[PDB]
Write a protein that binds this ligand. Structure first.
Ligand SMILES: CO[C@H]1O[C@H](CO)[C@@H](O)[C@H](O[C@H]2O[C@H](CO)[C@@H](O)[C@H](O)[C@@H]2O[C@@H]2O[C@H](CO)[C@@H](O)[C@H](O)[C@H]2NC(C)=O)[C@@H]1O
Ligand SMILES: CO[C@H]1O[C@H](CO)[C@@H](O)[C@H](O[C@H]2O[C@H](CO)[C@@H](O)[C@H](O)[C@@H]2O[C@@H]2O[C@H](CO)[C@@H](O)[C@H](O)[C@H]2NC(C)=O)[C@@H]1O
Ligand SMILES: [Ca+2]
Ligand SMILES: [Ca+2]
Ligand SMILES: [Mn+2]
Ligand SMILES: [Mn+2]
Lengths: 240, 240
């Protein structure tokens, strides 16, 4: 289809169109990307992702069209630790994408350690909300919590300073305009605090014509829950 | 998801979200539900159907919600003869539905011969565009071409006389309003000729909470092509 749209105001336990990978699962009408014990407390060494089952037609070589898409979602992070890790990401990848071996911790379940910074060995666009930046392990990160745009590498092509707020929902709108090739990110907390970051990228040179979209999160030595609360997505092929 | 929508202005050959059953296949940016020969002419004894891969949440028992839905599509029928058969139908059925054994000809690939008229043995709602009504084989049909609403039986609960026009596209709009429980069908040719038929039905007592939607077509000893040219669908769970 040239256009596809779906909306999850909440996530009831009865799901049919979500692909669950790793430890991801539904609890209390929300998606818990990373594992939690019986008490609902976060635990270390966990990775989880979800993808919508239907494939998205991102662009079409035969007609020179590229999709205009929007992804709106909200999530919250919680941890008893002073440095909860590692973060959550909205991503776009080839339909057959699976969790790479050893992609936990700072790799967010998106990259393998051996090629995490080799832009030639990956095919993924992701918007990350990174809460762990120890300069000793996450050597690629700026020294502060941040929102980042990742294009084939865990070393973001761009980041902006972000404030982690325990237990508070962050609302995010990610949009891509094929005319300007601008990928825009706007995130806000309920008190009006706003974060914005934009990057120009030709998706045709990074991803295949058909892709799958979803979320990924992970915790290494440090942990926190990564709870996806809602998600709506829409894409339509346009002439350029 | 509470809401889902998709649109196929045309049908390019590289489809990823369609389930093809029987003889259905893509040819000339359109879906040819029934088999044709090397030169594009319809052949006898053929059945074919397509279903969208993503499941639709038609109703939810927990929240007591029922979805409204709208399906818009266009198709054309062509045959060397004039007594083309057997027809095409838009249908909604359980997710695991498959072509019943011996469901060709007048059963449109939707029902099995032994239980075609047993409402307690089927789970399907369909809107049929029936072009063959010979009483020797299609004993359940009115004696003329027609559009009918089928609920668990090949014997339509409601029909309206219709005119088959070789090679001309018919634009169809099917709508279900959960508030009134009315399933409305509006079909029109480009010259404005309009056909309407509606019926009140409680989908909750006929279909499961999750379903798949698609089209089915068949030809028995008489034949014609059943070409699906475009299709858009949208559904949203609502509180009535
Ligand atoms: C206290 O933890 C810090 O210090 C120790 C020791 O120096 C590091 O080992 C820690 O690094 C691990 O944990 C952080 C925080 O969760 C992650 O950001 C790091 O990535 C790292 O986690 C490992 O990451 C690799 C990939 O680089 C994974 O393959 C591996 O599975 C992860 N380990 C675990 C136990 O999950 C931190 O700086
Ligand atoms: C000339 O054809 C008409 O008269 C003969 C002789 O009585 C019937 O056999 C024909 O019936 C078959 O063809 C029509 C038109 O295509 C269908 O509408 C009928 O359903 C029938 O086709 C068979 O239908 C059964 C289901 O009831 C299928 O199991 C069977 O496969 C179909 N036959 C074929 C060859 O496909 C018609 O009245
Ligand atoms: Ca990090
Ligand atoms: Ca008939
Ligand atoms: Mn980072
Ligand atoms: Mn009929």
């Amino acid at each position: 289809q040239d256009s596809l749209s779906f909306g999850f105001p909440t996530f009831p336990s009865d799901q049919k169109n979500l692909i669950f990978q790793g430890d991801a699962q539904i609890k209390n009408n929300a998606v818990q990307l990373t594992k939690t014990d019986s008490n609902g407390n976060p635990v270390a060494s966990t990775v989880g992702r979800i993808l919508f089952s239907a494939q998205v037609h991102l662009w079409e070589k035969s007609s020179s069209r590229v999709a205009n898409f929007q992804s709106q979602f909200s999530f919250s992070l919680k941890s008893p630790l002073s440095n909860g890790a590692d973060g959550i990401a909205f991503f776009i990848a080839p339909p057959d994408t699976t969790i790479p071996s050893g992609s936990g911790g700072g790799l967010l379940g998106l990259f393998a350690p051996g090629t995490a910074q080799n832009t030639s060995a990956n095919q993924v666009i992701a918007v990350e909300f990174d809460t762990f930046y120890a300069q000793d392990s996450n050597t690629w990160d700026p020294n502060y919590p941040h929102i980042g745009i990742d294009v084939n590498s865990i070393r973001s092509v761009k980041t902006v300073k972000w404030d982690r707020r325990d237990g508070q929902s962050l609302n995010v709108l990610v949009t891509f305009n094929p005319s300007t090739r601008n990928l825009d990110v706007v995130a806000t907390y309920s008190d009006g605090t706003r974060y914005e970051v934009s990057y120009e990228v030709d998706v045709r040179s990074v991803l295949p014509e058909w892709v799958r979209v979803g979320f990924s999160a992970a915790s290494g030595e440090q942990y926190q829950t990564h709870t996806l609360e809602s998600w709506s997505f829409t894409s339509t092929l346009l002439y350029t």
